[PDB]
Enzyme design. Structure first.
Site, PDB file in Angstrom:
ATOM      1  N   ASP A   1      18.698  43.400  25.748  1.00 23.64           N
ATOM      2  CA  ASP A   1      19.295  42.354  26.878  1.00 23.64           C
ATOM      3  C   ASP A   1      19.464  43.185  27.929  1.00 23.64           C
ATOM      4  OD1 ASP A   1      20.759  40.610  27.524  1.00 23.64           O
ATOM      5  OD2 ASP A   1      22.549  40.466  26.908  1.00 23.64           O
TER       6      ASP A   1
ATOM      7  N   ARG B   1      23.024  42.000  35.385  1.00 24.90           N
ATOM      8  CA  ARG B   1      24.204  41.960  34.966  1.00 24.90           C
ATOM      9  C   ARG B   1      24.630  42.820  34.224  1.00 24.90           C
ATOM     10  NH1 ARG B   1      21.233  37.949  32.483  1.00 24.90           N
ATOM     11  NH2 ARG B   1      20.774  38.378  30.405  1.00 24.90           N
ATOM     12  N   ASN B   2      23.963  43.824  33.100  1.00 24.06           N
ATOM     13  CA  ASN B   2      24.565  44.283  32.391  1.00 24.06           C
ATOM     14  C   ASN B   2      23.920  46.089  32.558  1.00 24.06           C
ATOM     15  OD1 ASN B   2      24.836  42.461  30.558  1.00 24.06           O
ATOM     16  ND2 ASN B   2      23.274  42.596  29.566  1.00 24.06           N
TER      17      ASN B   2
ATOM     18  N   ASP C   1      27.251  46.358  27.612  1.00 22.18           N
ATOM     19  CA  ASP C   1      26.299  45.646  26.811  1.00 22.18           C
ATOM     20  C   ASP C   1      25.403  45.711  25.443  1.00 22.18           C
ATOM     21  OD1 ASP C   1      26.431  42.893  26.528  1.00 22.18           O
ATOM     22  OD2 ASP C   1      26.756  41.470  27.663  1.00 22.18           O
TER      23      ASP C   1
HETATM   24  C1  LIG Z   1      28.997  41.968  36.846  1.00 22.18           C
HETATM   25  C2  LIG Z   1      30.314  41.374  36.443  1.00 22.18           C
HETATM   26  C3  LIG Z   1      31.715  42.029  36.264  1.00 22.18           C
HETATM   27  O1  LIG Z   1      30.783  43.251  36.758  1.00 22.18           O
HETATM   28  N1  LIG Z   1      32.812  42.411  37.241  1.00 22.18           N
HETATM   29  C4  LIG Z   1      33.773  43.525  37.540  1.00 22.18           C
HETATM   30  C5  LIG Z   1      33.670  44.710  37.029  1.00 22.18           C
HETATM   31  C6  LIG Z   1      34.515  46.057  36.901  1.00 22.18           C
HETATM   32  N2  LIG Z   1      34.725  46.981  36.356  1.00 22.18           N
HETATM   33  C7  LIG Z   1      34.203  47.614  34.628  1.00 22.18           C
HETATM   34  N3  LIG Z   1      33.722  48.141  34.031  1.00 22.18           N
HETATM   35  C8  LIG Z   1      33.603  48.340  32.534  1.00 22.18           C
HETATM   36  C9  LIG Z   1      33.906  47.405  32.091  1.00 22.18           C
HETATM   37  C10 LIG Z   1      33.721  46.183  33.407  1.00 22.18           C
HETATM   38  C11 LIG Z   1      33.056  44.454  31.770  1.00 22.18           C
HETATM   39  C12 LIG Z   1      32.541  44.310  30.850  1.00 22.18           C
HETATM   40  N4  LIG Z   1      32.814  42.974  30.615  1.00 22.18           N
HETATM   41  C13 LIG Z   1      31.706  42.526  29.381  1.00 22.18           C
HETATM   42  C14 LIG Z   1      32.995  42.699  31.436  1.00 22.18           C
HETATM   43  C15 LIG Z   1      33.125  40.874  31.914  1.00 22.18           C
HETATM   44  C16 LIG Z   1      33.495  40.738  33.258  1.00 22.18           C
HETATM   45  C17 LIG Z   1      33.964  41.046  33.611  1.00 22.18           C
HETATM   46  C18 LIG Z   1      34.021  42.739  33.641  1.00 22.18           C
HETATM   47  C19 LIG Z   1      33.609  43.090  32.673  1.00 22.18           C
HETATM   48  N5  LIG Z   1      33.718  45.871  34.419  1.00 22.18           N
HETATM   49  C20 LIG Z   1      34.947  45.747  38.170  1.00 22.18           C
HETATM   50  O2  LIG Z   1      36.129  47.027  38.551  1.00 22.18           O
HETATM   51  C21 LIG Z   1      36.653  46.271  39.543  1.00 22.18           C
HETATM   52  C22 LIG Z   1      38.143  47.127  39.116  1.00 22.18           C
HETATM   53  F1  LIG Z   1      37.173  48.892  38.848  1.00 22.18           F
HETATM   54  F2  LIG Z   1      39.150  47.600  40.362  1.00 22.18           F
HETATM   55  F3  LIG Z   1      38.331  46.857  38.056  1.00 22.18           F
HETATM   56  N6  LIG Z   1      35.330  44.324  38.922  1.00 22.18           N
HETATM   57  C23 LIG Z   1      34.446  44.124  38.324  1.00 22.18           C
HETATM   58  N7  LIG Z   1      34.203  42.593  39.610  1.00 22.18           N
HETATM   59  C24 LIG Z   1      35.650  41.729  39.812  1.00 22.18           C
HETATM   60  C25 LIG Z   1      33.472  42.107  40.797  1.00 22.18           C
HETATM   61  C26 LIG Z   1      32.288  41.292  40.184  1.00 22.18           C
HETATM   62  N8  LIG Z   1      32.992  39.614  40.914  1.00 22.18           N
HETATM   63  C27 LIG Z   1      32.374  38.789  41.720  1.00 22.18           C
HETATM   64  C28 LIG Z   1      33.000  38.986  39.467  1.00 22.18           C
END
Ligand SMILES: *CCC(=O)Nc1cc(Nc2nccc(-c3cn(C)c4ccccc34)n2)c(OCC(F)(F)F)nc1N(C)CCN(C)C
Length: 281
Positions: free
Chosen positions: A135, A139-140, A153
């Site tokens: 995968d 995105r991952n 992922d």
């Molecule tokens: C691409 C979508 C996304 O990455 N959103 C995101 C992720 C983080 N940091 C983070 N760190 C470790 C693991 C994950 C994660 C794992 N899985 C299965 C997820 C599903 C949905 C969203 C995130 C994860 N993510 C992040 O860090 C921000 C902070 F450090 F402040 F907490 N922010 C974000 N966002 C909200 C930015 C992307 N948005 C536009 C969706």
């Protein structure tokens, strides 16, 4: 004969982590931003907390516990409550797909080619572990800093060919459900295409059921505007029908590393307290 998997599964106390806010939700469940504060040692670790699905989060925890590489997301442990919680390294800049979309006007060629090197290093490591990701996609790939990305992922990963996101899959995987490290190479090609197009959707509009026909006819994703023929030829090689004719990850590291030494020659872009990160705990 396979080697024993002597990885350690760390089980964490719920009272050691504080959910600070919801990062995201969906079928998967709910991912939270939090801190992990192990009792005693004066340390606060920023973490992401992901709350038969139990068997699946356990399968993923098994995989993440068994990998240790600078370009693969690190598993910190699981917590056994109502539902099983995955506790991973907080990656503050989110996924790479959202990052390149949100910062199109600021991604230089140096960053783009370095991401291609780092992702290739991570996948080469997974291949060393005889692990098929199945995968790989923009995105991952998570962003710890703009200078440091890691592959994440592992909900479809399989420990070794092995017998789903159609627009990232090799033709052999769509037709015969075959997955190899070389079908991961195909997905790497699509992932690089995503980055070079600053986040475009592959075969945007084309229905997934049509993808198998298009690929058989010989059509591939278009050449991104910023891509020299050198870079696009690498992607095209990842999309050969003959899986063993595609490049190896160890070779992709080499090629993209050379390009990263003169990035503007290969990508043409206009205007080109006690907190401890998990990598240090
Ligand atoms: C691409 C979508 C996304 O990455 N959103 C995101 C992720 C983080 N940091 C983070 N760190 C470790 C693991 C994950 C994660 C794992 N899985 C299965 C997820 C599903 C949905 C969203 C995130 C994860 N993510 C992040 O860090 C921000 C902070 F450090 F402040 F907490 N922010 C974000 N966002 C909200 C930015 C992307 N948005 C536009 C969706």
């Amino acid at each position: 004969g396979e080697a024993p998997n002597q990885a350690l599964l760390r089980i964490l106390k719920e009272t050691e982590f504080k959910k600070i806010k919801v990062l995201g939700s969906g079928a998967f469940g709910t991912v939270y931003k939090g801190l992990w504060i192990p009792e005693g040692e004066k340390v606060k670790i920023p973490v992401a907390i992901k709350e038969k699905a139990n068997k699946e989060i356990l399968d993923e925890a098994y995989v993440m516990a068994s990998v240790d590489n600078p370009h693969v997301c690190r598993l910190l442990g699981i917590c056994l409550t109502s539902t099983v919680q995955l506790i991973t390294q907080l990656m503050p800049f989110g996924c790479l797909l959202d990052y390149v979309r949100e910062h199109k006007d600021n991604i230089g060629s140096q960053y783009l080619l370095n991401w291609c090197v780092q992702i290739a290093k991570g996948m080469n490591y997974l291949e060393d572990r005889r692990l098929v990701h199945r995968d790989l996609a923009a995105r991952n790939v998570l962003v710890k800093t703009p200078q440091h990305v890691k592959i994440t992922d592992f909900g479809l990963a399989k420990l070794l060919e092995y017998h789903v996101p159609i627009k990232w899959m090799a033709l052999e995987s769509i037709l015969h459900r075959i997955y190899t490290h070389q079908s991961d190479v195909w997905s790497y090609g699509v992932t690089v295409w995503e980055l070079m197009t600053f986040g475009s959707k592959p075969y945007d509009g084309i229905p997934a059921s049509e993808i198998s026909s298009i690929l058989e006819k010989g059509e591939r994703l278009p050449q991104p505007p910023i891509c020299t023929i050198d870079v696009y030829m690498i992607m095209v090689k990842c999309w050969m029908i003959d899986a063993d004719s595609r490049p190896k990850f160890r070779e992709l590291i080499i090629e993209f590393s050379k390009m990263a030494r003169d990035p503007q020659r290969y990508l043409v872009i206009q205007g080109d307290d006690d907190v401890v990160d998990a990598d240090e705990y």
